[PDB]
Amino acid sequence: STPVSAEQQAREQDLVERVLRSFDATADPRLKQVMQALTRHLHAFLREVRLTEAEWETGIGFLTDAGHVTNERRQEFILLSDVLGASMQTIAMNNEAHGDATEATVFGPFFVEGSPRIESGGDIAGGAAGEPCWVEGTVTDTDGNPVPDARIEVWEADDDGFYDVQYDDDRTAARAHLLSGPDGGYAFWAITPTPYPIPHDGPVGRMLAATGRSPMRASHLHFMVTAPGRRTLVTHIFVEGDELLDRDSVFGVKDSLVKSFERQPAGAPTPGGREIDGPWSRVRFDIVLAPA
């Protein structure tokens, strides 16, 4: 729609102006800039869609429900940021990869401080069910130097799609950290990653259901890599051929992070001579760290 009269347009515009000038005294000029931009976009959204009072109530309830479900592990506001692409966008603006630097992507909620320490050629599965997957590669800097003693945190879901922290028996599984060797090398046994849904029993899940979207993530293994003077890398690698690669629920996929997970025959000869019942896979991931 119904055409907004000039009088009515003028009233709405006057209000946006009142809100913007409310921030004029803000002491930190970046905070001021952020709050004024937030104002303009929030009011532009409201005035574009002509939000109704019932719709406003719905949004308020949504936020409130997200507040009530958010706790020590579960972070519904971060999941909302994830499914709206705001997390990936914020990573993209702050982590432009120059030269050969590995691309960054979403962190998620399932990183735990204090992961067990393994050696190269060790095994992060720690009880977790899944097909054995051998992961290897090299850490270098953007000048091509191997980087020994870079800290490599790795974590992933098991075959039922759960991170160890999601269980209630304080188990540790499918996570560890290791340190790159003298030639920058790292390797470990893990499990072949498979798709799982993000937490979807809260408001974010309701919004996904109402919009006909899926909570499912494309298969991945997480990596967080740190080294002195290097920009910390938060990333994961995806599985080439995975049908979810174009519909990841948190838009975390980048082509350069998709890796060939190569299935090996049952009985095929294994790194370190490990004995395996049936198939196993292997994947290579070379990591390049940029300057801080």
What is d(CA 36, CA 31) in angstroms, rounded to the nearest whole number?
A: 9
Return phi, psi of residue 63, to 5°: -60, -45
Question: What is 160-196 written as a DSSP string?
Answer: TS--GGGSSS----SEEEEE--TTSEEEEEEE----E
Interacting residues with ligand HGX between 17 and 56 (CB under 6 A): 30-31, 34, 38, 42, 51, 55-56
Residue 2's SS3 state is coil
Q: Does 252 bind Fe ion (CB under 5 A)?
A: no
| Interatomic CA distance for residues 77 and 89, integer angstroms | 15
d(CA 150, CA 181): 8
Binding mask 202-231 for a second copy (x = CB under 8 A): -----x--xxxx------------------
> Does 73 contact Cu ion by CB under 5 A?
no
86 binds ligand HGX (CB under 6 A): yes
Check binding of 203 to Fe ion (CB under 5 A). no
Of the pair 30, 98, the CB lying nearest ligand HGX is at: 30
Binder among 73, 90, 263, 291 for a second copy (CB under 8 A):
90
Tokens of 116: 């067990």
Could you give the CA distance from residue 104 to residue 227 in angstroms, rounded to a whole number? 15
Instruction: Answer yes or no whether residue 80 interacts with ligand HGX by CB under 6 A.
Output: yes
Q: Which residues bind ligand HGX (CB under 6 A)?
A: 30-31, 34, 38, 42, 51, 55-56, 58-60, 62-63, 77, 80-81, 84, 86, 206-207, 210
- Positions touching Cl ion (CB under 5 A) are 44
